[PDB]
Design a protein around this ligand. Structure first.
Ligand SMILES: [Cl-]
Length: 206
């Protein structure tokens, strides 16, 4: 798992530019329904108990997920050596994640072995959630209003199965973008499964 993998059959779906601050895109149908289900089924027997339950897949652990990992590498244009594995979270019944940052809220804390600061987060929605559950970004320039109360606190994205949210947590010059602060709104009914892909500015392992 270095570089970008084979060029077949690169993803060519709709890309919606959501926001300048932070820099965020929604990728429509980034994953197939099959892929979403595959991940949930593989994750489930491994889950342990923000309050929700989570598990990890090592980068490249699994050939189905590896294909997605290569997809991510190619759409972001950032080589796989800069990527962590796949973290899968499951939420239900009020469960959530208070708005937070992905970067060290002091940048001297991310060293060469971690690959420096996290630059891109790609949030992959593995289920469509039913009520609430929006990803919220409170510090965003523009807020939604047309949507749980929680969501009206920033820019929000609805978790629709197969969509992915992609956003930058560093500014172009490499400084922290406090606009990338983000949380998961209470999920109100019934199941939020998401997978997170974090990508670093430099390669991990050094
Ligand atoms: Cl989220």
């Amino acid at each position: 798992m270095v570089g970008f993998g084979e060029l077949k059959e690169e993803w060519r779906g709709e890309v919606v530019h959501l926001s300048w601050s932070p820099r965020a895109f929604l990728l429509k149908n980034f994953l197939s329904d099959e892929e979403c289900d595959y991940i949930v089924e593989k994750a489930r027997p491994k889950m342990v108990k923000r309050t929700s339950t989570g598990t990890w897949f090592a980068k490249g652990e699994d050939s189905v997920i590896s294909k997605i990992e290569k997809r991510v590498a190619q759409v972001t244009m950032i080589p796989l050596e800069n990527h962590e594995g796949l973290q899968v979270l499951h939420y239900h019944d009020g469960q959530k994640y208070e708005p937070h940052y992905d970067y060290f809220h002091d940048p001297v804390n991310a060293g060469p072995e971690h690959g420096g600061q996290r630059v891109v987060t790609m949030l992959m929605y593995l289920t469509t959630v039913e009520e609430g559950g929006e990803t919220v970004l409170p510090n965003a320039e523009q807020k939604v209003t047309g949507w749980s109360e929680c969501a009206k606190r920033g820019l929000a994205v609805k978790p629709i199965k197969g969509d992915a949210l992609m956003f930058y947590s560093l500014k172009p010059d490499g400084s922290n973008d406090p606009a990338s602060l983000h949380g998961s709104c209470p999920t109100l009914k019934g199941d939020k499964w998401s997978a997170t892909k974090w990508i670093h500015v430099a390669p991990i392992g050094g």
